[PDB]
Amino acid sequence: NQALLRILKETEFKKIKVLGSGAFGTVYKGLWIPEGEKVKIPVAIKELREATSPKANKEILDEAYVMASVDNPHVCRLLGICLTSTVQLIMQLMPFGCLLDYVREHKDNIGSQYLLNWCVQIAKGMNYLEDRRLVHRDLAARNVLVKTPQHVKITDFGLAVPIKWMALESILHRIYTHQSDVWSYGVTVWELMTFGSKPYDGIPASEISSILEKGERLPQPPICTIDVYMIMRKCWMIDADSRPKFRELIIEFSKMARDPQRYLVIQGDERMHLPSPTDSNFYRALMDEEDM
Ligand SMILES: CN1CCC(c2ccc(-c3ccc4c(c3)C(=O)N([C@H](c3cccc(F)c3)c3nc5ccccc5[nH]3)C4)cc2)CC1
Ligand SMILES: Nc1ncnc2c1ncn2[C@@H]1O[C@H](COP(=O)(O)OP(=O)(O)NP(=O)(O)O)[C@@H](O)[C@H]1O
Numbered sequence: 299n300q301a302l303l304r305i306l307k308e309t310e311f312k313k314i315k316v317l318g319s320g321a322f323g324t325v326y327k328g329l330w331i332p333e334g335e336k337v338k339i340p341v342a343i344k345e346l347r348e349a350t351s352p353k354a355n356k357e358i359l360d361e362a363y364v365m366a367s368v369d370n371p372h373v374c375r376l377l378g379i380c381l382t383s384t385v386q387l388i389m390q391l392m393p394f395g396c397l398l399d400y401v402r403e404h405k406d407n408i409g410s411q412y413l414l415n416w417c418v419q420i421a422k423g424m425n426y427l428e429d430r431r432l433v434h435r436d437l438a439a440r441n442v443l444v445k446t447p448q449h450v451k452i453t454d455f456g457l458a459v460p461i462k463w464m465a466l467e468s469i470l471h472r473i474y475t476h477q478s479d480v481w482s483y484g485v486t487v488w489e490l491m492t493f494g495s496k497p498y499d500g501i502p503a504s505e506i507s508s509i510l511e512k513g514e515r516l517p518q519p520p521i522c523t524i525d526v527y528m529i530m531r532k533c534w535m536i537d538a539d540s541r542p543k544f545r546e547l548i549i550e551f552s553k554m555a556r557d558p559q560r561y562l563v564i565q566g567d568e569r570m571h572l573p574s575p576t577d578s579n580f581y582r583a584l585m586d587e588e589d590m
């Protein structure tokens with residue numbers, strides 16, 4: 299459906315403030331000025347690294363239409379594109395940022411309820427991408443965006459190097475499947491349970507494949523019970539077909555989310571903020587009106 303990707307003019311939007319960069323380009327906080335109107339609508343804008351040719355832009359558009367066609371509460375959708383020399387991409391602005399920075403800044407105030415619900419939502423989004431036959435290839439806490447504290451969405455999928463998030467067969471044989479995404483999901487969960495720790499911190503990326511082949515894995519986070527750690531370890535099995543399926547990950551984390559303090563051991567957990575019905579309805583009406 300071509301109607302899901304809006305082709306924008308350079309003159310109808312403006313970059314306002316840089317937000318960061320990653321690997322494909324630089325992300326800005328921007329404003330869309332609807333023509334003939336007086337309003338300023340905040341947007342996110344990604345300007346590509348290098349300028350491109352009409353041929354490479356066709357490759358861009360072909361993938362852009364796919365990323366504009368997703369429809370799931372836990373998966374971000376691409377909204378627009380500006381075909382300038384350097385192409386500019388447009389999606390919804392998430393004022394809370396990515397989940398990695400969120401858990402790092404709130405590391406002393408995040409309860410077991412939020413952590414397990416984030417795992418559920420990430421698996422729900424990943425299960426949708428598999429249903430659409432879309433391989434993520436870059437699943438990580440940095441590519442999980444926070445719309446509201448109770449609602450996260452996965453982003454930056456389908457962009458065919460994050461060595462420390464890749465499955466062993468991706469490092470060794472550039473093999474990317476939905477089962478290699480499960481490995482990245484396991485590392486993503488590890489990031490959340492360590493409140494944003496860098497996986498294999500201090501180990502050179504050139505040696506990661508060596509340590510994985512000989513049997514070493516990311517260590518058990520201090521707040522994790524053995525039940526949670528064994529899920530992460532199953533995501534990191536050498537046989538890709540032995541790793542759990544995302545639909546299985548949804549069920550298992552939903553079970554643990556029903557009794558969070560038995561599976562996560564967090565200091566002050568009984569004193570952390572729970573999602574209130576009053577808070578969730580307020581958040582929805584102001585920032586998050588989608589179906590759910
Ligand atoms: C020879 N030459 C090699 C490279 C070249 C090329 C370059 C770029 C894209 C391409 C095409 C399309 C997307 C991306 C990137 C890319 O990074 N995207 C993110 C994405 C992915 C999935 C869902 C979603 F909502 C967003 C994203 N982050 C944003 C942040 C702010 C504003 C807009 C944003 N858009 C979408 C494809 C091919 C073509 C051939
Ligand atoms: N729609 C958005 N709303 C708010 N912040 C965003 C949005 N898209 C991206 N960002 C942020 O912009 C910064 C740069 O994003 P990006 O260029 O994708 O880098 P990255 O995610 O760190 N690297 P990569 O793994 O390649 O995607 C990060 O801090 C993102 O969280």
Ligand SMILES: [Mg+2]
Nearest residue numbers: 320440441454
């Ligand atoms: Mg990203």
